[PDB]
Amino acid sequence: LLAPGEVAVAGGGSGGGSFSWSGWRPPVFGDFLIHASSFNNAEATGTPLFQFKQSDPFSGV
């Protein structure tokens, strides 16, 4: 888990192994703070999401 590169690799990084392992890039995530009534929980984990750019400054939600 404590790898020097960007992907975790076997052995604990003892050997460099694959320089770029099979060309695998880790995903990037995004956190959002939603008004719970604005988003129905029953949506399955597959739905593509769209963010409206609120036009008020320094908001947090």
Binding site: F58, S59, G60, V61
Partner: protein, 49 residues
């Protein structure tokens, strides 16, 4: 219009109008200088008629 401006002036409305939702929503930099400078008793309790 000038009936509306006459009422709002003599009634004391439109004050403290800078910040609306509770301040935990806003991240930082919210000055809110306009509403008040300091309180000697505590949270303003809203009475209603």
């Amino acid at each position: 219009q000038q009936v509306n401006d006459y009422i709002k002036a003599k009634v004391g409305a439109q004050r403290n109008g800078t910040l609306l939702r509770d301040p935990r929503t806003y991240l930082a930099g919210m000055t809110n200088v306009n509403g008040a400078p300091g309180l000697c008793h505590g949270q303003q309790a809203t009475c209603e008629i």
